[PDB]
RNA sequence: GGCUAAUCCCCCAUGUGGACCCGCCCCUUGGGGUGUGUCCAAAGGGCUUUGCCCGCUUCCGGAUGGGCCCGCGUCCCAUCAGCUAGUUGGUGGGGUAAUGGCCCACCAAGGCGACGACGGGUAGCCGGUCUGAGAGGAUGGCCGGCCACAGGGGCACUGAGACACGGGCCCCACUCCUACGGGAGGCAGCAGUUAGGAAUCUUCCGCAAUGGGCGCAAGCCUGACGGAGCGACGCCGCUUGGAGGAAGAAGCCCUUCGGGGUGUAAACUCCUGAACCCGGGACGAAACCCCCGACGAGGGGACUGACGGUACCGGGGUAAUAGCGCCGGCCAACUCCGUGCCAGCAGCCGCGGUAAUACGGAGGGCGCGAGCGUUACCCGGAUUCACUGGGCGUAAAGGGCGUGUAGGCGGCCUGGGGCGUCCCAUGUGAAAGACCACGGCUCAACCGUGGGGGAGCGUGGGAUACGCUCAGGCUAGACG
């Protein structure tokens, strides 16, 4: 069995971007869909869309990269420099509203699952709620 | 270790073990001498070091180094123990306070008199 | 507020008394994971109403005896013997790990 | 030496021999009543019970047998007297108790 | 008791001119003139490249010797400045400038820092009508720093204020030369002081 | 007996008292119930005595007994003044 | 053995009221009301003696203070794995202010344990304190809160309250008295003695303040306390001068013998005036008390100091303690001489067996400065027990392999619950400390006033993404 779908999706994205792929198929679920929506709104991925692979539902995450570079290693700069699951099964993480971290001095995001839905750090702070600290992205 | 493993067993604090059982944890400990001896040092050095076996007020029997150039210490004189080992003499884990109880300070010592315990001279 | 807990009646064998098992979740104070510990309270059953495997509420009471400071407030959910079987199996496992 | 707090100790002993005495009387009357209730003599047991209740309240008047300890003794006494009386009861006097 | 002894040897050891002699660190006699090298037998020898700790230490020493304080009050005032809101270096400099004796020197009542410390210590100085003999006394903005009328007849004070005619005073200060008054207008900023010291080096020194 | 008295909270040669409601059986500098004023004998400030009268009026209505000095200070702020 | 008083004790009466058995009602564990029956009260003293004051009795309530109970938290060893006979529960009883195996009799055979029982080791706990970027580690002296003990062990009496430090009984050890039969003791109260130890103070002053006990008050008591003394033990402030003064005295040091250094440092010129002398000289102190008004309010008045003639103000006035560590690298500061694997230094690396910047002295220098070093201990660095924040192919580390128990972890969709989770309100989080602001001692240390913050837990309300749970559904995992 697959034991952490959210971390699995994050790692699919991490590997796909580390080899500069165009898209990636992640097994589909509403919670993953919300995470992907937050990513697309924050500009980390070009986007995503529902798809069917051999009858089973999946999510095509279309990733984005920087421009091609000079000198040796012309591989473009990554847009998702870093992705890291935080609250994983076996050690769940919950933060209050004063405990919401500032990711990379604001240049990054923290995705929270809260009573009011899945938000970013800024969104949860302006909303004034805390919740499960899912992942850092920057 | 998993988090569950750390909940079940957890990290183990590391105990320190005192290098100096000059007991009661006291800074100094007075005693009576048994032997005043000259001992040969370890491999890389060569000299004649003046040490003293001591019976202590804590019921302990140790060996202490005699600092300075010359000492008035004898077989049955009382002395104070300061602590601190001598790298090149295995066995002596303690030092001797000079200028205390029988062990007069180093005569004609003019540079470092806090250590070696000698009074301030006069300049005519 | 007299404390009210919820547990499963795990032992019947006493007169006018039941042994209830009450669970409790809380985050570990350093490692943060949600750990689940349980405790057996002795509840006072005056009418012998409650039987083994029942899920009842327990209420803080004026002491009935030594180790007895709680009374069975009411029945919540009657007759789930799986938790009782878990307790019995855990206790039976003590036959090993001795010599 | 020779602190006059000694006086207190002296007084103490006095007070002891007072309290003791009173207390003993109470007990010797109480049994005297209960026995007669056990043997089916309503009037005599009632009379002794009234005397015992009076003695108990008088001991409560002083530092001997003060707050609700006296009510305890009176309650237990009247309970045992009325209960023991119910063997061909016939509450003859009817004074000590409420009808 | 602060440092008491030969001073211009510290003009030399720090390599920079620090006028704690008052005058004569102006006239060509400071011994920084025609002898800029440090004191001792090895003064005129080549200087080996100093480590980072050496640079930080010499900078902090330069500052402390300039203001003439002991290391104890120096470090305690530094911690005080570190706890306050604002840049630690500029706040530290302003607190050092707030010292009563340093203010007496800044107002030109004394020729040097040590002379100002003595004029304070002996009660010749007035603060808001009252006398203060504590050189470590801190002057708040708005306080009036004058000379007690008992000491107004003194020849040294009249000499110093005779030379103070036409001379200019710090922008965060002001004084009336005839009535011997004076006013600590505001705390001086980093620019207000011409101190030949890099305060960031002192901050980095106390980092360890 | 709950009382109203003074607790010396200054320093050596600098006495500063807290007018305080406390059980008489505790230390004079120990734990108290309510702090209902402060007294400064040297009178080094414009305000050297404050009371918060109505609280003292309450605690007197329930049976607190002030010290002669405490009663003096309470009357000085007019806890008893009834016109 | 005898006499005698009372706010000592007893009996009767009065029953506002209260207590108790039984009945009823409302509440719901023994809360409140009610009916009859039974039982229960008391003390006088003082004056300005016709009125008031100090008291006394029963009761309801308030307040403060406590008793008992419960959730949760509270060190090490598993080379401590089984523990348990009042032990677990019941009925009745005893005891208490009060629940209770708290104790007792009888009945049942239970209770606890790997979620650390039992055993052993260590240890008063907390507010806080030290350190640390923080998490965390360590600690709990002093001040404040709670606990426990009063030579060791047990026991009760008196009382609202003790199982009572300066109360009592008994056993035990010790010291003293002893007519040998028997007695008296209890500083872990303030000083002080002695022992032990590296080491920790005066057999001080005082009731003037603050607080306590008794008293109508006057007042008495108070080694609580307020002060003083001793000790650089800590913190803070201060002095040992300031300015002028030689391309630069002697001495000492090095030298390429030309000189360089100590160095404006000294001498010396002038000025200021630590100490000490002289005089004035406190705040802390206003009530209690007196008197007017009714011993109230209010108004006004007067007695009251240990510190101490100290602090402080005014006048006069002398240039008037410097020491300690270090100078090979870490680490800031270098040369000469002397010693030659000796004598010695040493935190680690390491120096010294003939030029030693590392030994010893000198000169000079660096660091601090009434301190400076040393030892011990705690944290730190140490991300070296790694939650933040580490690892296991060859460096320490994958268990010889499997089966599987407890436990940990759990695919997709919908819904109910709202336990975790989150939010709001509120209660609590004492004071001191910490933080911020203002202020009081000439400044600070110190202290006051005010403000802010705060994890956790209680209660009420709300949110439902995730975790959980319950119900239903699906087939991608699993099995067939
Ligand atoms: Mg050798
Ligand atoms: Mg049963
Ligand atoms: Mg029972
Ligand atoms: Mg078993
Ligand atoms: Mg008496
Ligand atoms: Mg009898
Ligand atoms: Mg009693
Ligand atoms: Mg700052
Ligand atoms: Mg300005
Ligand atoms: Mg630092
Ligand atoms: Mg008390
Ligand atoms: Mg009133
Ligand atoms: Mg007689
Ligand atoms: Mg007689
Ligand atoms: Mg008679
Ligand atoms: Mg009477
Ligand atoms: Mg009567
Ligand atoms: Mg009636
Ligand atoms: Mg009646
Ligand atoms: Mg037994
Ligand atoms: Mg039995
Ligand atoms: Mg039975
Ligand atoms: Mg019972
Ligand atoms: Mg458990
Ligand atoms: Mg112990
Ligand atoms: Mg800190
Ligand atoms: Mg602790
Ligand atoms: Mg303690
Ligand atoms: Mg003490
Ligand atoms: Mg004991
Ligand atoms: Mg005892
Ligand atoms: Mg009494
Ligand atoms: Mg009692
Ligand atoms: Mg006791
Ligand atoms: Mg005693
Ligand atoms: Mg006593
Ligand atoms: Mg006796
Ligand atoms: Mg001794
Ligand atoms: Mg003292
Ligand atoms: Mg008094
Ligand atoms: Mg008094
Ligand atoms: Mg009178
Ligand atoms: Mg006396
Ligand atoms: Mg005292
Ligand atoms: Mg000394
Ligand atoms: Mg100092
Ligand atoms: Mg020369
Ligand atoms: Mg000079
Ligand atoms: Mg003069
Ligand atoms: Mg006065
Ligand atoms: Mg006055
Ligand atoms: Mg009159
Ligand atoms: Mg009046
Ligand atoms: Mg008086
Ligand atoms: Mg006097
Ligand atoms: Mg003077
Ligand atoms: Mg001189
Ligand atoms: Mg160096
Ligand atoms: Mg050395
Ligand atoms: Mg030679
Ligand atoms: Mg040589
Ligand atoms: Mg050699
Ligand atoms: Mg050398
Ligand atoms: Mg060295
Ligand atoms: Mg040397
Ligand atoms: Mg020197
Ligand atoms: Mg020291
Ligand atoms: Mg360490
Ligand atoms: Mg660590
Ligand atoms: Mg660290
Ligand atoms: Mg290690
Ligand atoms: Mg880790
Ligand atoms: Mg490692
Ligand atoms: Mg190998
Ligand atoms: Mg290996
Ligand atoms: Mg293997
Ligand atoms: Mg192996
Ligand atoms: Mg399972
Ligand atoms: Mg799931
Ligand atoms: Mg589960
Ligand atoms: Mg909820
Ligand atoms: Mg709150
Ligand atoms: Mg606070
Ligand atoms: Mg405060
Ligand atoms: Mg001020
Ligand atoms: Mg809530
Ligand atoms: Mg909902
Ligand atoms: Mg749901
Ligand atoms: Mg299902
Ligand atoms: Mg199918
Ligand atoms: Zn100069």
User: How far apart (Å, rounded) are the C-alpha atoms in residues C22 and C58?
Assistant: 9
User: How far apart (Å, rounded) are the C-alpha atoms in residues A77 and A73?
Assistant: 10
User: How far apart (Å, rounded) are the C-alpha atoms in residues E135 and E132?
Assistant: 8
Q: 3-state class of D44 per DSSP?
A: helix
8 Å CB contact between D96 and D53: yes
8 Å CB contact between E124 and E199: no
- Strand G lies under 7 A from the Cβ of residue F57: no
Question: What is the maximum span of chain E, computed from C-alpha positions, in angstroms?
Answer: 55
User: How far apart (Å, rounded) are the C-alpha atoms in residues B69 and B97?
Assistant: 14
Q: 3-state class of A103 per DSSP?
A: helix
A chain contacts of residue C31, beta-carbon cutoff 8 Å? 91
Domain that holds residue F26: 1-83
Return the CATH architecture of domain D1-99: Up-down Bundle (1.20)
Binding-site residue ranges of E for Zn(2+): 8, 11, 25, 30
User: What is the domain class of A81-138 according to CATH?
Assistant: alpha beta
C99, closest nucleotide (Cα–C1'): G81
Structure tokens, B114: 């806090």
Which DSSP helix (H) or strand (E) runs through E146?
Answer: strand E145-147
> Regarding beta strands B29-39 and B61-65, do their DSSP bridges make them parallel or antiparallel, or are they unpaired?
unpaired
Same domain, E122 and E184: yes
Domain that holds residue E90: 1-96+194-208
Q: 3-state class of C77 per DSSP?
A: strand
**Which region holds residue E129: left if phi is over 0, alpha if psi is between -120 and 50, else beta?**
left
Cβ burial of B64 (10 Å; 0-12, 13-18, 19+) is buried
Angle (nearest 5°) at CA F34 between F28 and F40: 60
User: How far apart (Å, rounded) are the C-alpha atoms in residues E36 and E11?
Assistant: 8
Question: What is the maximum span of chain F, computed from C-alpha positions, in angstroms?
Answer: 41
8 Å CB contact between B33 and B53: yes
What CA–CA distances, in Å, run from A122 to A80, A132, B73?
A: 19, 15, 77
User: How far apart (Å, rounded) are the C-alpha atoms in residues E193 and E98?
Assistant: 13
User: How far apart (Å, rounded) are the C-alpha atoms in residues E56 and E54?
Assistant: 6
Distance between Cα B51 and ligand 45 center (Å): 28
Instruction: Return residues 78-137 of A near C (CB < 8 Å).
Output: 90-93
Structure tokens, C75: 């029945």
Same domain, E80 and E65: yes
User: How far apart (Å, rounded) are the C-alpha atoms in residues C41 and C45?
Assistant: 12
B chain contacts of residue A85, beta-carbon cutoff 8 Å? none
- Strand G lies under 7 A from the Cβ of residue E167: no
In this structure, which topology does domain B1-124 adopt according to CATH?
A: OB fold (Dihydrolipoamide Acetyltransferase, E2P) (2.40.50)
Residues 32-51 of F with CB under 7 A from strand G: 33, 35, 38, 40-45, 50
User: How far apart (Å, rounded) are the C-alpha atoms in residues A44 and A10?
Assistant: 12
Same domain, E40 and E63: yes
8 Å CB contact between B79 and B65: no
Q: How many domains does chain F have?
A: 1
* C36 has a chain A CB within 8 A of its CB: no
> Whole-number Å distance, CA D40 to C1' G168?
47
User: How far apart (Å, rounded) are the C-alpha atoms in residues E176 and E162?
Assistant: 12
**Residue labelled with tokens 């307790």:** C87
Cβ burial of E75 (10 Å; 0-12, 13-18, 19+) is middle
- Strand G lies under 7 A from the Cβ of residue B11: yes
Buried b (16+ CB within 10 A) or exposed e, D23-58: eebbeebbeebbebbeeebbeebbbbbeebbebbee
**Residue labelled with tokens 């100094």:** B28
Structure tokens, A134: 């899912």
- Strand G lies under 7 A from the Cβ of residue E152: no
Angle (nearest 5°) at CA B93 between B89 and B97: 105
Q: How far is A70 from chain B (nearest CA, A)?
A: 43
**Which region holds residue E66: left if phi is over 0, alpha if psi is between -120 and 50, else beta?**
alpha
User: How far apart (Å, rounded) are the C-alpha atoms in residues F36 and F25?
Assistant: 19
C chain contacts of residue B4, beta-carbon cutoff 8 Å? 33
Instruction: Return residues 79-138 of A near B (CB < 8 Å).
Output: 90-91
What CA–CA distances, in Å, run from C9 to A53, C12, C67, C90, E131?
A: 50, 8, 16, 16, 84
From the list E6, E8, E62, the residue with the least C-alpha distance to E30 is E8
Determine the angle formed by the axes of helices E52-67 and E71-83, rounding to 10 degrees: 100
Structure tokens, B33: 């001498």
User: How far apart (Å, rounded) are the C-alpha atoms in residues B27 and B29?
Assistant: 7
What CA–CA distances, in Å, run from B103 to B65, B86, B107, B113, B115?
A: 12, 19, 11, 14, 13
D12, closest nucleotide (Cα–C1'): G158
Question: What is the maximum span of chain D, computed from C-alpha positions, in angstroms?
Answer: 68
DSSP 8-class letter at B15: P
Q: Between chains, do C32 and A90 touch, taking CB under 8 Å as contact?
A: no
> Whole-number Å distance, CA B46 to C1' G351?
12
Question: Residue E135 CA to chain centroid, in angstroms?
Answer: 11
Neighbours of E202 (CB within 10 A): 24
Angle (nearest 5°) at CA C19 between C15 and C21: 170
Structure tokens, A12: 């699919």
Domain boundaries, chain A: 3-80, 81-138
User: How far apart (Å, rounded) are the C-alpha atoms in residues D85 and D34?
Assistant: 9
Neighbours of C20 (CB within 10 A): 25
Torsion of CA E137, E140, E145, E148, to 10 degrees: -50
> Regarding beta strands C34-44 and C68-77, do their DSSP bridges make them parallel or antiparallel, or are they unpaired?
parallel
From the list E58, E94, E113, E64, the residue with the least C-alpha distance to E173 is E94
Structure tokens, E180: 């011997």
Q: 3-state class of B53 per DSSP?
A: strand
Nearest protein residue to G137's C1' (by CA)? B13
Which DSSP helix (H) or strand (E) runs through D80?
Answer: helix D69-84
Q: Which residue of B has its CA nearest to C28?
A: B7
Distance between Cα D8 and ligand 32 center (Å): 12
Q: 3-state class of A133 per DSSP?
A: strand
* A51 has a chain C CB within 8 A of its CB: no
Domain boundaries, chain B: 1-124
User: How far apart (Å, rounded) are the C-alpha atoms in residues C88 and E196?
Assistant: 82
Q: How far is A2 from chain C (nearest CA, A)?
A: 21
Q: How far apart are the first and last CA of chain D?
A: 64
Q: How was this one solved?
A: X-ray
Binding-site residue ranges of E: 8, 11, 25, 30
| H-state helical runs in A19-136 | 30-42, 121-127
Buried b (16+ CB within 10 A) or exposed e, A15-26: ebbeeeeebbeb
User: How far apart (Å, rounded) are the C-alpha atoms in residues A31 and A4?
Assistant: 12
Structure tokens, F31: 């734990």
Q: Which residue of C has its CA nearest to B1?
A: C31
CA atoms within 13 A on the CB side of B16: 4
**Residue labelled with tokens 């590391």:** B14
User: How far apart (Å, rounded) are the C-alpha atoms in residues C28 and C36?
Assistant: 9
**Residue labelled with tokens 């005080």:** E80
- Strand G lies under 7 A from the Cβ of residue D31: no
User: How far apart (Å, rounded) are the C-alpha atoms in residues B91 and B54?
Assistant: 13
From the list A56, A20, A50, the residue with the least C-alpha distance to A37 is A50
User: How far apart (Å, rounded) are the C-alpha atoms in residues C1 and C16?
Assistant: 25
User: How far apart (Å, rounded) are the C-alpha atoms in residues A82 and A105?
Assistant: 14
* C33 has a chain A CB within 8 A of its CB: yes
Q: How many domains does chain C have?
A: 1
Q: How far is C6 from chain B (nearest CA, A)?
A: 25
Contacts of B33 (CB under 8 A, 6+ apart): B52, B53, B54, B73, B74, B75, B76, B77, B78, B79
Question: Residue B36 CA to chain centroid, in angstroms?
Answer: 15
Cβ burial of D80 (10 Å; 0-12, 13-18, 19+) is middle
Structure tokens, B48: 């004649």
From the list C87, C50, C56, the residue with the least C-alpha distance to C73 is C56
**Residue labelled with tokens 């080996």:** E48
- Strand G lies under 7 A from the Cβ of residue D15: yes
Distance between Cα B10 and ligand 75 center (Å): 24
Contacts of B124 (CB under 8 A, 6+ apart): none
Q: Is the dihedral of CA E126, E127, E133, E139 positive or negative?
A: negative
Residues 2-61 of C with CB under 7 A from strand G: 3, 11, 13-17, 19, 23-27, 29-34, 36-42, 44, 60-61
- Strand G lies under 7 A from the Cβ of residue E117: yes
User: How far apart (Å, rounded) are the C-alpha atoms in residues E40 and E47?
Assistant: 13
**Residue labelled with tokens 């008035």:** B72
Q: Is the dihedral of CA F28, F29, F30, F36 positive or negative?
A: positive
Q: How far is B4 from chain A (nearest CA, A)?
A: 7
Pick the residue of C28, C29, C31 with the most B CBs within 10 A to test the interface with B by mutation.
C31
8 Å CB contact between A6 and A135: yes
What CA–CA distances, in Å, run from B11 to A111, B7, B16?
A: 31, 9, 16
């Amino acid at each position: 069995m697959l034991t952490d779908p959210i971390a699995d999706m994050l790692t699919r994205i991490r590997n796909a971007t580390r080899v500069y792929k165009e898209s990636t198929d992640v097994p589909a679920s509403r919670f993953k869909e919300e995470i992907l929506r937050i990513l697309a709104r924050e500009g980390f991925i070009k986007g995503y869309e529902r798809v069917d692979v051999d009858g089973k539902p999946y999510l095509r995450v279309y990733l984005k990269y920087g421009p091609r570079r000079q000198g040796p290693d012309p591989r473009p700069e990554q847009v998702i420099h870093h992705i890291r699951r935080i609250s994983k099964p076996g050690r769940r993480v919950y933060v209050g509203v004063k405990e919401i971290p500032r990711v990379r001095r604001g240049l990054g995001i923290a995705i929270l699952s809260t009573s009011k839905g899945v938000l970013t750090d800024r969104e949860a702070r302006k909303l004034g709620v805390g919740g499960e600290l899912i992942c850092e992205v920057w | 270790p998993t988090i569950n493993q750390l909940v079940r067993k957890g990290r183990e604090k590391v105990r320190k073990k005192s290098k100096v059982p000059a007991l009661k944890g006291a800074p100094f400990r007075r005693g009576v001498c048994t032997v005043v001896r000259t001992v040969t040092p370890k491999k890389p050095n060569s000299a004649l070091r003046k040490v003293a076996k001591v019976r202590l007020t804590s019921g302990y029997e140790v060996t202490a180094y005699i600092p300075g150039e010359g000492h008035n210490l004898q077989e049955h004189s009382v002395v104070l123990i300061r602590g601190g080992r001598v790298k090149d003499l295995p066995g002596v884990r303690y030092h001797i306070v000079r200028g205390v109880y029988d062990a007069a300070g180093v005569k004609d010592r003019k540079k470092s008199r806090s250590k070696y315990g000698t009074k301030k001279p006069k300049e005519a | 507020p007299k404390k009210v807990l919820t547990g499963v009646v795990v032992s019947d064998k006493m007169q006018k008394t039941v042994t209830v098992l009450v669970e409790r979740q809380f985050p570990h104070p350093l490692y943060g994971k949600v750990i689940k510990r349980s405790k057996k309270y002795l509840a006072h059953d005056p009418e012998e109403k409650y039987k083994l495997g029942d899920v009842v509420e327990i209420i803080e009471s004026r002491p009935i005896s030594k180790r007895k400071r709680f009374r069975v407030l009411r029945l919540v959910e009657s007759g789930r013997m799986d938790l009782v079987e878990k307790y019995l199996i855990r206790r039976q496992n003590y036959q090993s790990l001795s010599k | 030496r020779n602190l006059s707090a000694l006086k207190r100790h002296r007084q103490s002993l006095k007070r002891r021999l007072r309290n003791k005495a009173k207390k003993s009387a109470i007990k010797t009357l109480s049994k005297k009543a209960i026995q007669l209730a056990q043997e089916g003599k309503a009037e005599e047991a009632l009379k002794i019970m009234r005397k015992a209740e009076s003695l108990i309240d008088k001991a409560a008047k002083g530092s001997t047998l003060h707050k609700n300890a006296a009510a305890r003794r009176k309650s237990r006494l009247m309970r045992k007297v009325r209960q023991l009386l119910e063997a061909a009861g016939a509450p003859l006097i009817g004074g000590g108790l409420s009808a | 008791g602060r440092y008491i002894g030969p001073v211009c040897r510290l003009c030399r050891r720090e390599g920079v001119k620090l006028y704690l002699k008052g005058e004569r660190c102006y006239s060509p006699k400071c011994a920084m003139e025609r002898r800029p090298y440090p004191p001792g037998q090895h003064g005129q020898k080549r200087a080996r490249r100093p480590s980072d700790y050496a640079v930080r230490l010499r900078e902090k020493q330069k500052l402390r010797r300039i203001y003439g304080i002991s290391e104890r009050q120096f470090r305690n005032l530094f911690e005080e400045a570190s706890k306050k809101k604002g840049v630690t270096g500029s706040v530290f400099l302003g607190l050092l400038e707030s010292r009563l004796d340093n203010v007496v020197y800044r107002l030109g009542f004394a020729v040097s820092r040590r002379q100002a410390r003595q004029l304070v210590r002996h009660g010749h100085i007035t603060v808001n009508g009252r006398r203060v003999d504590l050189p470590s006394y801190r002057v708040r903005p708005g306080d009036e720093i004058a000379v007690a009328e008992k000491s107004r007849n003194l020849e040294l004070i009249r000499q110093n204020l005779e030379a103070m005619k036409g001379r200019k005073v710090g922008p965060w200060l002001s004084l009336d030369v005839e009535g011997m008054k004076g006013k600590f207008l505001r705390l001086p900023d980093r620019e207000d002081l011409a101190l030949p010291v890099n305060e960031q080096l002192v901050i980095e020194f106390y980092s360890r | 007996m709950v009382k109203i008295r003074l607790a010396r909270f200054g320093s050596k040669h600098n006495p500063h008292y807290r007018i305080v409601v406390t059980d008489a059986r505790r230390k004079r500098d120990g734990k108290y119930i309510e702090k209902i004023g402060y007294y400064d004998p040297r009178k080094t400030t414009p305000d050297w005595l404050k009371v918060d009268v109505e609280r003292a009026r309450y605690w007197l209505s329930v049976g607190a007994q002030p010290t002669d000095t405490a009663r003096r200070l309470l009357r000085q702020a007019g806890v008893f003044r009834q016109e």
